[PDB]
Ligand binder design. Structure first.
Ligand code: HEM
Length: 401
């Protein structure tokens, strides 16, 4: 609908929250596929441009850091191969198909307890009460920590992210260092405990992981854990809430899923495409190149706009329709290539198990009202801030009795 070129700052969180992004993306894909925003920041907005960049890390490097407004960090997403590959193989010990599928019972049980807390009410905030608690509880359990310790880790990772985005004065630098120290010392205390007396938790697995004769240091484990805390929490939340929102807005598709649970995996893929919780990841050019009509220079960052790519008309045909039967559905919500989301199968499992139970226990779930759901103004990961819903009450399972 945009008749004029978007005049936007792609580092401004409100761009991703005010609802104007998809029509801005439409203009970019049609007119200026590798777009430069009002500060000259380049962005790959078509599916082909995103995929080309992903397939060519030699040219589009991750070592400059994957944010535009934070320094590079010592975890795997800010590495190139071969370093990245080694680190990923080490951490992958925690995410084998065996270990993910072993979480089916615990995640299912977790989902039942969350729904138990709301089922008698006839209403809840789908974000606050269902979508937000689940991913963090799953990560907490995976790490083998107590709920109280989970919550400390959550607060620390929140403060670290905040600090990393702005530590200009002398004091924010120290608060940032204090927070890093607090988080590092807590996590290393846990690591030290598992080094002596191992469990089956993710800390123990990372401690024991060995690849090409190398093992992870305590600090490496601390930072890969931090990446998992950040990367696996709000992302999963936003696909759950935003994906469910679209199911609630398309009653025929909601009904189809209620009638046939085997349709759920296809539905989850469309929930992923539509929500695209990770709005962008940055790459740094290692050479000058002319890329989809734009002159890029060595050393500049470019944003890979995953939501923009996921609504590419040349690829999806009818991307502006939400359809649980979309097939094929080669969305890039999880990225593509060597950095393809390590947690993708765990995320898909959380999404499937929760939505299964929501369909079964809240079968007449509806939005309280059809107004658009408010979105988080963040330039990295974003989705619904709240989502009031209503449903016929039902009795809690209380499975531990
Ligand atoms: C809906 C949920 C999720 C989405 C949409 C998502 C999205 C992404 C994206 C876009 C990337 C970067 C890929 C690229 O640049 O090509 C990534 C990487 C990563 N994700 Fe996820 N993520 C999700 C859930 C999770 C979970 C649950 C975990 C772990 C428990 C996780 C851990 C990671 C890690 C460690 C990486 C770095 C992989 C690497 O650099 O090799 N993510 N994710």
């Amino acid at each position: 609908q945009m008749l004029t070129r978007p005049d936007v700052d792609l580092v401004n969180g409100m761009f991703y929250a005010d609802g104007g992004a998809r029509e801005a993306y439409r203009w970019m894909r049609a007119n200026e596929p590798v777009f430069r925003d009002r500060n000259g920041l380049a962005a790959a907005t078509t599916y082909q441009a995103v995929l080309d960049a992903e397939r060519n890390p030699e040219l589009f490097s991750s070592t400059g850091g994957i944010r535009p407004d934070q320094p590079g960090m010592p975890y795997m997403i800010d590495m190139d191969d071969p370093q990245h590959l080694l680190r990923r193989k080490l951490v992958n010990a925690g995410f084998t198909r065996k270990r993910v599928m072993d979480k089916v019972d615990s995640i299912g049980r977790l989902c039942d307890t969350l729904i138990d807390a709301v089922c008698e009410r006839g209403e809840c905030d789908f974000v606050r009460d269902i979508a937000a608690p689940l991913p963090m509880a799953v990560i907490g359990d995976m790490l083998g920590v107590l709920p109280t310790e989970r919550d400390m880790l959550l607060k620390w990772s929140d403060d670290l992210v905040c600090g990393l985005s702005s530590h200009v004065d002398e004091a924010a630098i120290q608060k940032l260092m204090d927070t890093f120290a607090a988080y590092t010392e807590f996590t290393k205390d846990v690591i030290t405990k598992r080094r002596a007396e191992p469990t089956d938790d993710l800390f123990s697995v990372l401690v024991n992981s060995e690849v090409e004769g190398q093992r992870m240091s305590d600090d490496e484990i601390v930072f890969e854990t931090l990446l998992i805390l950040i990367g696996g929490d709000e992302t999963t939340r936003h696909t759950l809430s935003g994906g469910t929102e679209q199911l609630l807005r398309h009653r025929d598709q909601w009904d189809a899923l209620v009638a046939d649970v085997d349709l759920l995996p296809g539905a989850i893929e469309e929930m992923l495409r539509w929500t695209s919780p990770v709005k962008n990841m940055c790459r740094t050019l290692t050479a000058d190149t002319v890329f989809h009509g734009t002159e890029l220079r060595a050393g500049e960052k470019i944003m890979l706009m995953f939501e923009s790519a996921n609504f590419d008309e040349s690829v999806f045909g009818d991307p502006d329709n939400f359809r649980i039967d979309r097939n094929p559905n080669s969305h890039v919500a999880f990225g593509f290539g060597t950095h393809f989301c390590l947690g993708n199968q765990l995320a898909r499992l959380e999404l499937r198990l929760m939505t299964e139970r929501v369909l079964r226990r809240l079968p007449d779930l509806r939005l309280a009202d059809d107004a658009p759901v408010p979105l988080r103004p963040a330039n990295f990961v974003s989705g619904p801030e709240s989502m009031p819903v209503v449903f016929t009450p039902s009795a809690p399972v209380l499975a531990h009795h």
